[PDB]
Tab-separated table of C-alpha atoms and ligand atoms in Angstrom:
chain	number	residue	atom	x	y	z
A	2	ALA	CA	0.032	-0.166	0.182
A	3	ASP	CA	0.854	3.661	-0.812
A	4	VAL	CA	-0.231	4.670	2.899
A	5	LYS	CA	1.616	2.876	5.860
A	6	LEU	CA	0.962	3.459	9.526
A	7	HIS	CA	3.995	2.840	11.712
A	8	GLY	CA	1.961	1.934	14.515
A	9	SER	CA	1.121	-0.165	17.597
A	10	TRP	CA	-1.619	-2.783	18.961
A	11	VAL	CA	-2.185	-0.739	22.191
A	12	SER	CA	-1.326	3.044	21.801
A	13	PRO	CA	-4.600	5.412	21.907
A	14	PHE	CA	-2.617	7.973	19.491
A	15	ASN	CA	-2.256	5.149	17.183
A	16	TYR	CA	-5.781	3.996	17.000
A	17	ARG	CA	-7.133	7.885	16.437
A	18	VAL	CA	-4.956	7.267	13.169
A	19	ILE	CA	-6.480	3.777	12.456
A	20	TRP	CA	-10.078	5.230	12.854
A	21	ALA	CA	-9.720	8.139	10.876
A	22	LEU	CA	-8.034	6.289	7.823
A	23	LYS	CA	-11.070	3.680	8.047
A	24	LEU	CA	-13.478	6.483	8.202
A	25	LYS	CA	-12.036	7.937	5.011
A	26	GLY	CA	-11.933	4.243	3.488
A	27	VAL	CA	-8.104	4.771	3.203
A	28	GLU	CA	-6.025	1.448	2.423
A	29	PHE	CA	-2.846	1.071	4.416
A	30	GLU	CA	-0.330	-1.271	5.832
A	31	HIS	CA	0.053	-1.251	9.490
A	32	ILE	CA	3.741	-1.736	10.440
A	33	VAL	CA	3.518	-2.691	14.396
A	34	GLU	CA	6.833	-1.390	16.064
A	35	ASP	CA	8.760	-2.915	18.942
A	36	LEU	CA	9.398	0.108	21.206
A	37	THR	CA	12.275	-1.585	22.921
A	38	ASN	CA	14.019	-2.074	19.284
A	39	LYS	CA	12.897	1.020	17.017
A	40	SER	CA	13.493	0.154	13.251
A	41	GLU	CA	15.604	2.267	10.862
A	42	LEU	CA	12.223	3.741	9.147
A	43	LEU	CA	10.824	4.840	12.067
A	44	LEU	CA	14.029	6.747	13.486
A	45	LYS	CA	14.429	8.225	9.761
A	46	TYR	CA	10.716	9.131	9.472
A	47	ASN	CA	10.482	10.820	13.053
A	48	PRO	CA	14.028	12.296	14.129
A	49	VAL	CA	12.483	14.612	16.489
A	50	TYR	CA	10.120	12.564	18.990
A	51	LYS	CA	11.282	8.597	17.845
A	52	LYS	CA	7.587	7.953	18.568
A	53	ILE	CA	4.575	6.335	16.860
A	54	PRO	CA	2.283	6.811	15.378
A	55	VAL	CA	3.949	8.016	11.997
A	56	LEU	CA	1.945	8.124	9.002
A	57	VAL	CA	3.654	7.779	5.775
A	58	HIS	CA	2.033	8.556	2.168
A	59	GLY	CA	3.904	8.388	-1.063
A	60	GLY	CA	6.678	7.807	1.290
A	61	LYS	CA	6.805	11.214	3.134
A	62	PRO	CA	6.320	10.635	6.747
A	63	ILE	CA	3.840	12.441	9.108
A	64	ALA	CA	4.482	12.525	12.821
A	65	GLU	CA	2.235	13.404	15.823
A	66	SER	CA	-1.531	11.947	16.104
A	67	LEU	CA	-3.087	15.260	15.970
A	68	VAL	CA	-1.108	16.834	12.731
A	69	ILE	CA	-1.746	13.227	11.155
A	70	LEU	CA	-5.521	13.769	11.637
A	71	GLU	CA	-5.648	17.012	10.030
A	72	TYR	CA	-3.415	15.791	6.871
A	73	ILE	CA	-5.720	13.021	6.690
A	74	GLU	CA	-8.787	15.526	6.765
A	75	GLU	CA	-7.146	17.822	3.959
A	76	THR	CA	-6.021	14.783	1.802
A	77	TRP	CA	-9.286	13.000	1.878
A	78	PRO	CA	-11.962	15.611	2.156
A	79	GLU	CA	-14.655	13.159	1.375
A	80	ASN	CA	-16.695	11.883	4.579
A	81	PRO	CA	-15.439	15.171	6.367
A	82	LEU	CA	-14.210	14.995	10.034
A	83	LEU	CA	-14.433	18.742	10.787
A	84	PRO	CA	-17.206	21.289	10.229
A	85	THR	CA	-16.980	23.806	7.277
A	86	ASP	CA	-17.769	27.208	9.386
A	87	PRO	CA	-14.342	28.671	10.712
A	88	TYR	CA	-15.908	29.577	14.264
A	89	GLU	CA	-17.322	25.653	14.296
A	90	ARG	CA	-13.712	24.444	13.301
A	91	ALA	CA	-11.915	26.983	15.800
A	92	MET	CA	-14.340	25.187	18.602
A	93	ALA	CA	-13.265	21.797	17.548
A	94	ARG	CA	-9.474	22.910	17.566
A	95	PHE	CA	-9.955	24.576	20.975
A	96	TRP	CA	-11.177	21.492	22.469
A	97	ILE	CA	-8.885	19.011	20.883
A	98	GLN	CA	-6.115	21.213	22.352
A	99	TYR	CA	-7.577	21.368	25.748
A	100	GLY	CA	-7.694	17.346	25.968
A	101	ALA	CA	-3.871	17.391	24.815
A	102	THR	CA	-2.944	19.915	27.426
A	103	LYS	CA	-4.766	18.018	30.418
A	104	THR	CA	-2.249	14.786	29.817
A	105	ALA	CA	-0.412	15.523	33.325
A	106	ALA	CA	-3.748	15.209	34.946
A	107	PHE	CA	-4.398	11.644	33.974
A	108	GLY	CA	-0.459	10.598	34.711
A	109	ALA	CA	-0.988	11.151	38.272
A	110	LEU	CA	-3.641	8.246	38.394
A	111	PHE	CA	-0.628	5.878	37.731
A	112	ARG	CA	1.924	7.909	40.427
A	113	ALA	CA	-0.051	8.512	43.438
A	114	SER	CA	-1.681	6.359	46.240
A	115	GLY	CA	-4.582	6.578	48.600
A	116	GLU	CA	-5.553	10.032	49.967
A	117	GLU	CA	-3.491	11.426	47.006
A	118	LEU	CA	-5.036	8.960	44.283
A	119	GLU	CA	-8.420	10.039	45.403
A	120	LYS	CA	-7.763	13.758	44.756
A	121	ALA	CA	-5.920	13.285	41.454
A	122	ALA	CA	-8.992	11.449	40.170
A	123	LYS	CA	-11.518	14.121	41.536
A	124	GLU	CA	-9.105	16.581	39.406
A	125	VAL	CA	-9.630	14.156	36.696
A	126	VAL	CA	-13.401	14.261	36.768
A	127	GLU	CA	-13.442	18.186	36.896
A	128	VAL	CA	-11.353	18.100	33.687
A	129	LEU	CA	-13.841	15.758	32.132
A	130	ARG	CA	-16.900	17.883	33.452
A	131	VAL	CA	-15.706	21.002	31.602
A	132	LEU	CA	-15.484	18.858	28.359
A	133	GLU	CA	-18.899	17.510	29.037
A	134	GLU	CA	-20.610	20.812	30.013
A	135	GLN	CA	-18.717	23.274	27.476
A	136	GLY	CA	-17.654	20.901	24.816
A	137	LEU	CA	-20.639	17.943	24.360
A	138	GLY	CA	-23.340	19.686	25.849
A	139	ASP	CA	-26.321	17.677	24.827
A	140	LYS	CA	-25.250	16.325	21.345
A	141	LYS	CA	-24.839	12.534	20.786
A	142	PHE	CA	-21.359	13.127	19.961
A	143	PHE	CA	-18.757	15.897	19.672
A	144	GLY	CA	-19.212	15.941	15.976
A	145	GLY	CA	-23.122	16.132	16.514
A	146	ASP	CA	-24.908	13.058	14.811
A	147	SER	CA	-21.826	11.473	14.053
A	148	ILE	CA	-18.297	11.105	15.021
A	149	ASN	CA	-15.662	13.709	14.137
A	150	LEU	CA	-12.028	14.554	14.767
A	151	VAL	CA	-13.086	15.766	18.331
A	152	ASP	CA	-14.498	12.491	19.291
A	153	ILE	CA	-11.436	10.618	17.759
A	154	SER	CA	-9.247	12.817	19.700
A	155	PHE	CA	-11.199	12.099	22.906
A	156	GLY	CA	-11.418	8.135	22.138
A	157	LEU	CA	-8.841	7.429	24.523
A	158	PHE	CA	-11.225	8.417	27.570
A	159	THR	CA	-13.312	5.096	26.578
A	160	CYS	CA	-11.525	1.505	26.823
A	161	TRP	CA	-7.868	3.137	27.566
A	162	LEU	CA	-9.362	5.262	30.514
A	163	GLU	CA	-11.610	2.021	31.821
A	164	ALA	CA	-8.264	-0.008	31.878
A	165	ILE	CA	-6.374	2.654	33.735
A	166	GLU	CA	-9.210	2.878	36.336
A	167	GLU	CA	-9.297	-0.879	36.711
A	168	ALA	CA	-5.094	-1.024	37.022
A	169	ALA	CA	-5.176	2.086	39.636
A	170	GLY	CA	-8.143	0.669	41.465
A	171	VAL	CA	-10.167	4.134	41.220
A	172	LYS	CA	-13.229	5.662	39.673
A	173	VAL	CA	-13.203	8.604	37.312
A	174	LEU	CA	-15.873	8.412	34.427
A	175	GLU	CA	-19.167	7.123	36.042
A	176	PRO	CA	-22.832	7.856	35.123
A	177	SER	CA	-23.581	9.232	38.464
A	178	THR	CA	-21.087	12.017	38.338
A	179	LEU	CA	-20.758	12.635	34.407
A	180	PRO	CA	-24.134	11.543	33.137
A	181	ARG	CA	-23.741	12.972	29.470
A	182	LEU	CA	-20.103	11.952	28.977
A	183	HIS	CA	-20.619	8.173	30.560
A	184	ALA	CA	-23.288	8.067	27.996
A	185	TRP	CA	-21.109	9.383	25.156
A	186	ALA	CA	-18.259	6.832	25.684
A	187	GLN	CA	-20.948	4.169	25.592
A	188	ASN	CA	-22.219	5.359	22.326
A	189	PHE	CA	-18.931	5.856	20.762
A	190	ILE	CA	-17.388	2.288	21.786
A	191	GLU	CA	-20.863	1.124	20.014
A	192	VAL	CA	-20.128	2.848	16.647
A	193	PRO	CA	-19.381	-0.080	14.665
A	194	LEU	CA	-15.950	1.520	13.258
A	195	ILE	CA	-14.686	1.870	16.726
A	196	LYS	CA	-16.171	-1.370	17.865
A	197	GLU	CA	-14.463	-3.356	15.207
A	198	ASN	CA	-11.054	-1.524	15.640
A	199	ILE	CA	-10.154	-1.355	19.461
A	200	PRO	CA	-7.489	-3.247	21.445
A	201	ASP	CA	-8.657	-6.426	23.267
A	202	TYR	CA	-9.590	-5.249	26.777
A	203	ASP	CA	-7.894	-7.914	28.699
A	204	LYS	CA	-4.615	-7.285	26.714
A	205	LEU	CA	-5.323	-3.796	27.311
A	206	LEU	CA	-5.641	-3.880	31.065
A	207	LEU	CA	-2.428	-6.008	31.101
A	208	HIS	CA	-0.376	-3.158	29.274
A	209	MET	CA	-1.879	-0.491	31.728
A	210	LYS	CA	-0.930	-2.985	34.746
A	211	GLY	CA	2.585	-2.976	33.430
A	212	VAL	CA	2.801	0.934	32.561
A	213	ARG	CA	1.391	1.478	36.190
A	214	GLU	CA	4.032	-0.694	37.677
A	215	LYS	CA	6.717	1.282	35.906
A	216	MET	CA	5.569	4.516	36.968
A	217	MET	CA	4.827	3.164	40.840
B	2	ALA	CA	-14.784	47.665	15.487
B	3	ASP	CA	-16.601	44.281	14.784
B	4	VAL	CA	-13.422	42.666	15.783
B	5	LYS	CA	-12.071	43.086	19.476
B	6	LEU	CA	-8.966	41.658	20.640
B	7	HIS	CA	-8.501	41.405	24.666
B	8	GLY	CA	-4.977	41.833	24.946
B	9	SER	CA	-1.728	43.023	26.542
B	10	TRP	CA	1.077	45.357	25.700
B	11	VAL	CA	3.549	42.511	26.688
B	12	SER	CA	2.369	39.135	26.088
B	13	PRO	CA	4.283	37.587	22.937
B	14	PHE	CA	0.900	35.367	22.607
B	15	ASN	CA	-1.165	38.511	21.890
B	16	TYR	CA	1.294	39.813	19.481
B	17	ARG	CA	1.289	36.557	17.357
B	18	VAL	CA	-2.325	37.761	16.969
B	19	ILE	CA	-1.947	41.463	16.331
B	20	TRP	CA	0.873	40.219	13.607
B	21	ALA	CA	-2.014	38.208	11.971
B	22	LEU	CA	-4.622	40.793	11.944
B	23	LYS	CA	-2.582	43.484	10.471
B	24	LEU	CA	-1.054	40.878	8.052
B	25	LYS	CA	-4.828	40.344	7.049
B	26	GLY	CA	-5.741	44.327	7.057
B	27	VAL	CA	-8.298	43.557	9.700
B	28	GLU	CA	-9.373	46.588	11.965
B	29	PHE	CA	-9.972	45.823	15.481
B	30	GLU	CA	-9.951	47.441	18.912
B	31	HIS	CA	-7.549	46.432	21.167
B	32	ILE	CA	-8.619	46.091	24.704
B	33	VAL	CA	-5.872	45.661	27.340
B	34	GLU	CA	-6.644	43.740	30.044
B	35	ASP	CA	-5.242	44.047	33.871
B	36	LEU	CA	-4.276	40.468	34.669
B	37	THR	CA	-4.282	41.560	38.487
B	38	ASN	CA	-8.305	42.392	37.872
B	39	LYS	CA	-9.646	40.241	34.869
B	40	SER	CA	-12.937	42.210	33.503
B	41	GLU	CA	-16.274	40.647	33.275
B	42	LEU	CA	-15.802	40.173	29.269
B	43	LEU	CA	-12.538	38.225	29.673
B	44	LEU	CA	-14.147	35.697	32.211
B	45	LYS	CA	-17.164	35.096	30.224
B	46	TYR	CA	-15.518	34.658	26.941
B	47	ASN	CA	-12.544	32.437	28.025
B	48	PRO	CA	-13.990	30.617	31.141
B	49	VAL	CA	-11.639	27.674	30.495
B	50	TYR	CA	-8.455	29.524	30.775
B	51	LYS	CA	-9.165	32.915	32.193
B	52	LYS	CA	-6.219	34.077	29.982
B	53	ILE	CA	-5.170	36.529	26.998
B	54	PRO	CA	-5.552	36.761	24.116
B	55	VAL	CA	-9.166	36.204	23.325
B	56	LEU	CA	-10.486	37.290	19.873
B	57	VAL	CA	-14.046	38.418	19.811
B	58	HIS	CA	-15.656	38.580	16.152
B	59	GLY	CA	-19.124	39.294	15.862
B	60	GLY	CA	-19.452	38.961	19.513
B	61	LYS	CA	-18.243	35.221	19.534
B	62	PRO	CA	-15.014	34.469	21.259
B	63	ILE	CA	-11.816	32.652	20.322
B	64	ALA	CA	-9.133	31.767	22.864
B	65	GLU	CA	-5.655	30.475	22.451
B	66	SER	CA	-3.413	32.246	20.062
B	67	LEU	CA	-2.617	29.031	17.946
B	68	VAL	CA	-6.730	28.389	17.589
B	69	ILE	CA	-6.912	32.070	16.826
B	70	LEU	CA	-4.188	32.283	14.276
B	71	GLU	CA	-5.909	29.132	12.441
B	72	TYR	CA	-9.305	31.070	12.684
B	73	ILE	CA	-8.110	34.399	11.106
B	74	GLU	CA	-6.542	32.301	8.224
B	75	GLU	CA	-9.586	30.722	7.493
B	76	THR	CA	-12.008	33.648	8.063
B	77	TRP	CA	-9.627	36.129	5.994
B	78	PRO	CA	-8.084	33.768	3.648
B	79	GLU	CA	-6.662	36.570	1.272
B	80	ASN	CA	-2.659	37.157	2.119
B	81	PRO	CA	-2.303	33.636	3.074
B	82	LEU	CA	-0.331	32.677	6.052
B	83	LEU	CA	-0.304	29.031	5.429
B	84	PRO	CA	0.789	26.939	2.379
B	85	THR	CA	-2.201	25.332	-0.062
B	86	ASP	CA	-0.637	21.878	-0.162
B	87	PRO	CA	-1.436	19.203	2.811
B	88	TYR	CA	1.973	17.901	3.238
B	89	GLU	CA	3.330	21.507	3.582
B	90	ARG	CA	0.322	22.542	5.982
B	91	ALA	CA	1.091	19.325	8.143
B	92	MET	CA	4.941	20.357	8.496
B	93	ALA	CA	3.943	23.937	9.505
B	94	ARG	CA	1.459	22.447	11.964
B	95	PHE	CA	4.286	20.082	13.025
B	96	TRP	CA	6.757	22.930	13.852
B	97	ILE	CA	4.211	24.955	15.420
B	98	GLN	CA	3.282	22.361	17.998
B	99	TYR	CA	6.985	21.497	18.535
B	100	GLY	CA	7.607	25.093	19.609
B	101	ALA	CA	4.591	24.725	21.670
B	102	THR	CA	5.783	21.619	23.497
B	103	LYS	CA	9.124	23.243	24.463
B	104	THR	CA	7.824	25.870	26.964
B	105	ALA	CA	9.356	24.171	29.976
B	106	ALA	CA	12.724	24.362	28.621
B	107	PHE	CA	12.426	28.286	28.537
B	108	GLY	CA	11.033	28.216	32.120
B	109	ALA	CA	14.216	26.844	33.541
B	110	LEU	CA	16.172	30.060	32.414
B	111	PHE	CA	14.058	31.949	35.091
B	112	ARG	CA	14.423	28.992	37.845
B	113	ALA	CA	18.074	27.955	37.542
B	114	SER	CA	21.242	29.509	38.712
B	115	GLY	CA	24.848	28.891	38.043
B	116	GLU	CA	25.936	25.471	37.141
B	117	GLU	CA	22.394	24.539	36.115
B	118	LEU	CA	21.410	27.400	34.388
B	119	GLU	CA	24.323	26.866	32.123
B	120	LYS	CA	22.686	23.563	31.345
B	121	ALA	CA	19.421	24.711	30.962
B	122	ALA	CA	20.563	27.425	28.289
B	123	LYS	CA	22.388	24.633	26.379
B	124	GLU	CA	19.171	22.459	26.406
B	125	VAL	CA	17.306	25.560	25.052
B	126	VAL	CA	20.177	25.957	22.319
B	127	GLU	CA	19.750	22.304	21.185
B	128	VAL	CA	15.548	22.660	20.904
B	129	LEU	CA	16.466	25.855	18.937
B	130	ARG	CA	19.137	23.936	16.645
B	131	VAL	CA	16.605	21.158	15.625
B	132	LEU	CA	14.345	24.002	14.641
B	133	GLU	CA	16.993	25.624	12.701
B	134	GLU	CA	18.273	22.679	10.582
B	135	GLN	CA	14.933	20.459	10.438
B	136	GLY	CA	12.553	23.584	10.260
B	137	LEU	CA	14.119	26.758	8.741
B	138	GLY	CA	16.952	25.252	6.630
B	139	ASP	CA	18.505	27.605	4.298
B	140	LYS	CA	15.014	29.698	3.775
B	141	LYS	CA	14.957	33.210	4.642
B	142	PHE	CA	11.647	32.753	6.804
B	143	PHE	CA	9.827	29.533	8.170
B	144	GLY	CA	7.211	30.819	5.206
B	145	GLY	CA	9.914	31.152	2.699
B	146	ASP	CA	10.254	34.426	1.094
B	147	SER	CA	7.688	35.898	3.381
B	148	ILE	CA	6.325	35.366	6.955
B	149	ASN	CA	3.714	32.769	7.673
B	150	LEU	CA	1.938	31.424	11.095
B	151	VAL	CA	5.219	29.317	11.477
B	152	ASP	CA	7.362	32.627	11.952
B	153	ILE	CA	4.522	34.286	13.797
B	154	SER	CA	4.624	31.244	16.144
B	155	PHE	CA	8.382	31.557	16.494
B	156	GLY	CA	8.716	35.192	17.042
B	157	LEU	CA	8.637	34.813	20.737
B	158	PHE	CA	12.326	33.888	20.048
B	159	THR	CA	13.143	37.209	19.035
B	160	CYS	CA	12.911	40.377	21.064
B	161	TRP	CA	10.995	38.473	24.179
B	162	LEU	CA	14.137	36.032	24.386
B	163	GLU	CA	16.319	38.603	24.014
B	164	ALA	CA	14.945	40.151	27.096
B	165	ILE	CA	14.902	36.828	28.910
B	166	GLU	CA	18.586	36.433	28.059
B	167	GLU	CA	19.524	39.547	29.787
B	168	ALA	CA	17.439	39.267	32.725
B	169	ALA	CA	18.831	35.836	33.273
B	170	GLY	CA	22.551	36.739	32.296
B	171	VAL	CA	22.778	33.882	29.951
B	172	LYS	CA	23.034	33.574	26.235
B	173	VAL	CA	21.111	31.125	23.889
B	174	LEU	CA	20.444	32.615	20.515
B	175	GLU	CA	23.945	33.720	18.947
B	176	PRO	CA	25.257	34.011	15.631
B	177	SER	CA	28.299	31.426	16.337
B	178	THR	CA	26.302	28.732	17.672
B	179	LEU	CA	22.912	29.284	15.338
B	180	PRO	CA	23.927	31.183	12.243
B	181	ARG	CA	20.867	30.697	9.988
B	182	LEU	CA	18.329	31.160	13.397
B	183	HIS	CA	20.335	34.439	14.434
B	184	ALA	CA	20.099	35.817	10.918
B	185	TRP	CA	16.358	34.640	10.842
B	186	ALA	CA	15.543	36.568	14.052
B	187	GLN	CA	17.151	39.630	12.950
B	188	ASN	CA	15.253	39.503	9.493
B	189	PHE	CA	11.870	38.797	11.393
B	190	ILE	CA	12.677	41.734	13.512
B	191	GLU	CA	13.091	43.972	10.640
B	192	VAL	CA	10.155	43.003	8.587
B	193	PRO	CA	8.243	46.298	8.818
B	194	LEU	CA	5.203	44.788	9.859
B	195	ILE	CA	6.951	43.141	13.004
B	196	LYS	CA	9.226	46.474	13.331
B	197	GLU	CA	6.040	48.795	14.043
B	198	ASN	CA	4.460	45.947	16.267
B	199	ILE	CA	6.647	44.940	18.958
B	200	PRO	CA	6.640	45.974	22.617
B	201	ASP	CA	9.212	48.704	23.432
B	202	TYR	CA	12.553	46.680	24.691
B	203	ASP	CA	13.381	48.815	28.010
B	204	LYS	CA	9.655	47.887	28.886
B	205	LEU	CA	9.799	44.451	28.122
B	206	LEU	CA	13.145	43.826	29.836
B	207	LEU	CA	11.706	45.291	32.932
B	208	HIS	CA	8.777	43.015	32.799
B	209	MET	CA	10.879	40.104	32.240
B	210	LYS	CA	13.118	40.974	35.099
B	211	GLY	CA	10.062	40.855	37.518
B	212	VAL	CA	8.734	37.697	36.007
B	213	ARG	CA	12.141	36.198	36.612
B	214	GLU	CA	12.085	38.012	40.016
B	215	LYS	CA	8.776	36.240	41.010
B	216	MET	CA	10.064	32.634	39.294
B	217	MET	CA	13.159	33.021	41.723
C	301	MRI	O1	-1.475	9.599	28.632
C	301	MRI	C1	-2.123	8.847	28.235
C	301	MRI	C2	-1.201	7.630	27.551
C	301	MRI	O2	0.018	7.804	27.674
C	301	MRI	C3	-1.958	6.597	27.173
C	301	MRI	C4	-1.294	5.547	26.671
C	301	MRI	C5	-1.967	4.262	26.794
C	301	MRI	C6	-1.378	2.918	26.019
C	301	MRI	C7	-0.351	3.031	25.460
C	301	MRI	O3	0.372	1.945	24.894
C	301	MRI	C8	0.147	4.149	25.371
C	301	MRI	C9	-0.365	5.237	25.815
C	301	MRI	O4	0.574	6.684	25.445
C	301	MRI	O5	-3.424	6.455	27.332
C	301	MRI	C10	-4.148	7.557	28.015
C	301	MRI	C11	-5.258	7.070	28.206
C	301	MRI	C12	-6.237	8.054	28.902
C	301	MRI	O6	-7.266	7.792	28.959
C	301	MRI	C13	-5.499	9.485	29.480
C	301	MRI	C14	-4.281	9.683	28.906
C	301	MRI	O7	-3.741	10.869	29.389
C	301	MRI	C15	-3.445	8.458	28.242
C	302	MRI	O1	6.927	30.648	28.043
C	302	MRI	C1	7.101	31.707	27.639
C	302	MRI	C2	6.168	32.890	28.142
C	302	MRI	O2	5.505	32.700	29.032
C	302	MRI	C3	6.426	34.335	27.612
C	302	MRI	C4	5.823	35.513	28.078
C	302	MRI	C5	6.371	36.623	28.358
C	302	MRI	C6	5.877	37.923	28.563
C	302	MRI	C7	4.588	37.910	28.702
C	302	MRI	O3	4.015	39.063	29.224
C	302	MRI	C8	3.609	36.778	28.816
C	302	MRI	C9	4.541	35.645	28.328
C	302	MRI	O4	3.671	34.561	28.337
C	302	MRI	O5	7.489	34.400	26.987
C	302	MRI	C10	8.163	33.398	26.517
C	302	MRI	C11	9.103	33.819	25.683
C	302	MRI	C12	10.026	32.861	24.903
C	302	MRI	O6	11.135	33.018	24.185
C	302	MRI	C13	9.881	31.492	25.138
C	302	MRI	C14	9.021	31.266	26.023
C	302	MRI	O7	8.733	29.860	26.373
C	302	MRI	C15	8.217	32.051	26.653
C	303	CL	CL1	0.825	11.177	18.791
C	304	CL	CL1	1.485	10.411	27.931
C	305	CL	CL1	-2.649	31.817	24.087
C	306	CL	CL1	4.326	29.985	29.745
C-alpha cells in the first residue's frame, strides 16, 4: 500500500489514526513497531520524537497524531471529520487542544496512592466535567449526529481510561457524576467502526497494569 | 470595531494575533486587560483558561493564540499565512506544535542558577538547533520568502527571548552557535509589520526582570 502506518496494537494515539483512515476508506499497511528496538524507518521518518504513530504517504512521513489527523482530513476531504464553518472549526481545535493539555492530570492516576490518588481522580473528573458541559453539551457526539476529529481525539477516555481505572483501583468516568459524558463513551464504543477497531480489553488491561508498575 | 482583541502590551501570545490581524488588514479594537483584575468580558469569553489573548468576532470569542491564528487564516483567506499543499500544511502545524511543547525548557531559564542555568541554556540551544536545521533550513523565513504562521509562532524567540537572556544573564540565540536562526531572528524583527508592532525593549526587559524575580 501507498499509505503506511508505523503503529502499535495498544497506543490510543495510533488508534486515532486507524479510525480516521477507516472513516475515509483509505487502504493502508499497519507496521507494528517494537518500542524496545525501533526500526531504521521509524528513526528516519520521525527523528524529532522517535515515537509512533507515523503516517507515511507516498514515502513522505507525518508524525504526531493531531497533525496526522488534520493531514488525513485535508488529503481525503470526502466523509468530512471537521465542520466547514471557521468558528465551528476553531471550537473543534480548541477542544482538541484542551484534551492534549490535560495529559498530566491523567498521569497522576499511575503515580499517586490512597489519600492523594482520590484527589488526582477528583481533578480528572473536573477536567472531564468541563469537556462534558462546555464541549459535548446535549449532542450525541462531539461531531453532532456522527463522530468527528473531536470524538476521535477523546476516544482515549473510553476503553483506555476504563483500563487505567481498573489498574489504579479508582473511579473517574461514572454515570452518576458525568451522565452525558458516560453516555457518550458508551455510544462511541458502540459505533461499528470503533467497535471493530479497538484493542482487546484483557490485553489492554495487562498493558496498563505494566505501565502503572513502571510509573510506581 | 466588529473585531476585538482582549490583549496585553507585553504578551508574545497576544502579539502573534496583532501580527496576523495586521497582515490580513483587519481593523480591530485592542482592549488591554489588567491581569490582577480581569474584566467580566474576559471571564465570560474565556471561562476555561481566563487568559489573554481572546479574539471576539461578531460577539463570539476565540481563545488560545494557536486556535485564533488558524481562525484568522480561515476567516480572511486573502494574503495566506499557510501553504495550500496538505503535506506542507502538516509540516507547518508540526513545527508550530513542536514550539508549543518546548515551553518548559525556556521556563528553566528563570528558575535555575549558575551550574544548572548553563545546562538549561544549553538545552534551549539544542531545541532551537533542531528548529533551525529541520524547520528553517536555508530559507529566509519559515514561510519561505515572506513570513507565515510558523514565523509568527516563533516570533517569541526574537525580542522576548533577548529580554529573557538579559534578565537571566545567559546567552542562547547567538550567531556563532545558531547562524541561520540568528540571521532569521534579525530578518523577522526588520520586517516592517513586525518592527512597527513589537513592545518597547526597555519596558519588555523590565517586565521579564519582574517575572524572573517572581519565578526566583
Ligand atoms: O497519557 C496517556 C497515555 O500515554 C496513554 C497510553 C496508553 C497506552 C499506550 O500503549 C500508550 C499510551 O500513550 O493512554 C492514555 C489514556 C487516557 O485515558 C488518558 C491519557 O492521558 C493517556
Ligand atoms: O513561556 C514563555 C512566556 O510565558 C513568555 C511571556 C513573556 C511575557 C509575557 O507578558 C507573557 C508571557 O507568557 O515569553 C516567552 C518567550 C520565549 O522566548 C519563550 C517562552 O517559552 C516564553
Ligand atoms: Cl501522537
Ligand atoms: Cl502520555
Ligand atoms: Cl495563547
Ligand atoms: Cl509560559
